[PDB]
Amino acid sequence: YSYEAEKRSAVTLTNENFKSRKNKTTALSDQNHRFVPYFGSSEWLRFDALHPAVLAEKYDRNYRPYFIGQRGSASLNQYLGMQQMLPELQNGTAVYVLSPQWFTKKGYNSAAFQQFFNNDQLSSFLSQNQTDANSQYAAKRILEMKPEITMKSQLSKVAKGQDLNTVDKTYIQFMAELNRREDSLFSPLAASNNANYDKKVLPYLKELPDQFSYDALDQLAVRDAEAHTKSNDFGIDDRFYKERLSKKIGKLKGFQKNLSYEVSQEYGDLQLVLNQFAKSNTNVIFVIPPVNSKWMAYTGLNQDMYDATVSKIRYQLESQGFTNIADFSKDGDQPYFMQDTIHMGWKGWVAFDRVVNSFVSNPTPAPSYKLNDRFYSKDWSGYTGTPSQFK
């Protein structure tokens, strides 16, 4: 199609590009250039010389990352976006960052939900009619997020477990067909490429060593990280620090004293993605990032709560077959692991590379998964004892 068109779609990172079926399926099915999907939220915007985009370009790897996510795109929105690219996951390989900031009790806004959801994702969703627990929970959550919804009756039938009437099926495949065609019509202008690749990827190639060396990458990361953090003591990027933290830094101290990520509906939402990976036989590495621990000190973010959160996430993942886990939750104290407060960069990007690039450069079949419906449950949403003792 167009390698440079796909290259710039792969790092555009706009909401409209997230829900563009044409863009992502195009890049993810190109048979002459391999794009691998990287699911996460705002973490992908932290361009610097060690960002995965830059690395896979410089050393010309047997793939390029296609990024899928933006602030607020947690697992429910991710699952529904996945509904638009089902072939591209089949027997595929994928990176999926589990951001722990996701797992709050009330979750995100309905407004943040709308900016990734659309009716193509919903018609796709209803078109695959399986009245299983996963369908039911999906429908339940959608009606929770957007209660004044089109095709509400069908969503209520799916959410109660009931089978869809001949008339329902026909309606939903017709709306499917139209939404697909609307995507194909509007993605050219509605979902156009950024300057992100030209302005925040390619420049950085000047800085990387012609010959690959993790030691050289680490040195470059520390030099550049030092250049871009002389405005504070948290080792937080200058621009992020003046733009989001400078003004209210006093009012901030202590503000996370009691905040937890241990109870969340996002646990069930995650289950939706795991079901999707299994049904599509996808081989995934799940990335867990830590938080600048100096920051966690200043805000009171309790690291043992973080550790229990990570543990429960990992339990859900491993107990089912998903064992590829680049878990960096305890690496937040390493100088320049993070680029901001809760987003890794620089050295963190190199650590990210060390596990992920081996995973993605060397695709292997996906193991056998055993899914466990008890993870959609309210009890698992609230459970806080030892993860092993759930049953």
Side-chain angles (χ1 to χ4, degrees), residues 44-56:
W44 304 137
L45 298 169
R46 279 72 178 76
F47 298 100
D48 63 45
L50 305 312
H51 194 281
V54 187
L55 290 195

Side-chain angles (χ1 to χ4, degrees), residues 113-133:
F113 175 74
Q114 185 65 52
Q115 62 190 336
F116 306 101
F117 173 81
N118 70 21
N119 279 0
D120 183 9
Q121 293 163 10
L122 186 100
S123 75
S124 294
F125 171 62
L126 293 162
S127 266
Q128 309 291 104
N129 39 23
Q130 67 256 109
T131 79
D132 45 50

Side-chain angles (χ1 to χ4, degrees), residues 45-240:
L45 298 169
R46 279 72 178 76
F47 298 100
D48 63 45
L50 305 312
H51 194 281
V54 187
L55 290 195
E57 175 56 14
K58 177 73 165 201
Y59 308 104
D60 195 345
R61 315 181 137 164
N62 52 355
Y63 72 93
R64 300 283 190 277
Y66 186 94
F67 295 98
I68 302 177
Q70 185 83 224
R71 165 131 182 208
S73 64
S75 316
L76 183 59
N77 284 312
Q78 293 287 1
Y79 170 80
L80 297 168
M82 284 179 186
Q83 296 319 315
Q84 289 164 296
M85 47 170 286
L86 263 41
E88 293 72 4
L89 295 172
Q90 196 71 34
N91 302 305
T93 38
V95 177
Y96 191 101
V97 194
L98 299 165
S99 171
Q101 293 69 8
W102 286 355
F103 290 75
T104 66
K105 184 47 225 183
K106 318 291 214 219
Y108 286 106
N109 233 337
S110 234
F113 175 74
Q114 185 65 52
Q115 62 190 336
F116 306 101
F117 173 81
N118 70 21
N119 279 0
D120 183 9
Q121 293 163 10
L122 186 100
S123 75
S124 294
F125 171 62
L126 293 162
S127 266
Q128 309 291 104
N129 39 23
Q130 67 256 109
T131 79
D132 45 50
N134 176 81
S135 55
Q136 270 173 250
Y137 174 86
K140 171 174 95 160
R141 286 286 295 143
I142 280 158
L143 289 167
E144 293 193 40
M145 292 319 288
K146 187 188 193 235
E148 293 130 307
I149 197 75
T150 206
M151 296 181 259
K152 198 188 162 204
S153 100
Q154 293 79 357
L155 267 166
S156 301
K157 275 189 183 170
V158 178
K160 276 217 165 234
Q162 323 175 8
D163 300 287
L164 290 180
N165 175 220
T166 179
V167 153
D168 297 326
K169 305 182 171 234
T170 54
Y171 179 51
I172 289 137
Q173 41 173 314
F174 192 79
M175 289 333 295
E177 169 186 306
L178 280 195
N179 273 320
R180 273 190 250 103
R181 276 150 164 122
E182 252 163 30
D183 203 290
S184 206
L185 179 58
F186 285 91
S187 289
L189 291 86
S192 78
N193 291 341
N194 274 331
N196 270 355
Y197 186 82
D198 285 331
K199 290 184 177 170
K200 310 178 157 257
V201 168
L202 280 188
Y204 288 124
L205 291 187
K206 85 181 66 165
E207 296 188 30
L208 263 42
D210 305 280
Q211 161 181 317
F212 195 87
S213 155
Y214 269 127
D215 292 342
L217 290 190
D218 273 323
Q219 298 154 20
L220 186 67
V222 307
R223 268 111 202 271
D224 286 350
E226 285 171 327
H228 291 54
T229 72
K230 55 157 299 186
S231 69
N232 56 101
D233 292 335
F234 285 99
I236 291 178
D237 177 283
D238 283 342
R239 196 160 332 182
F240 179 104

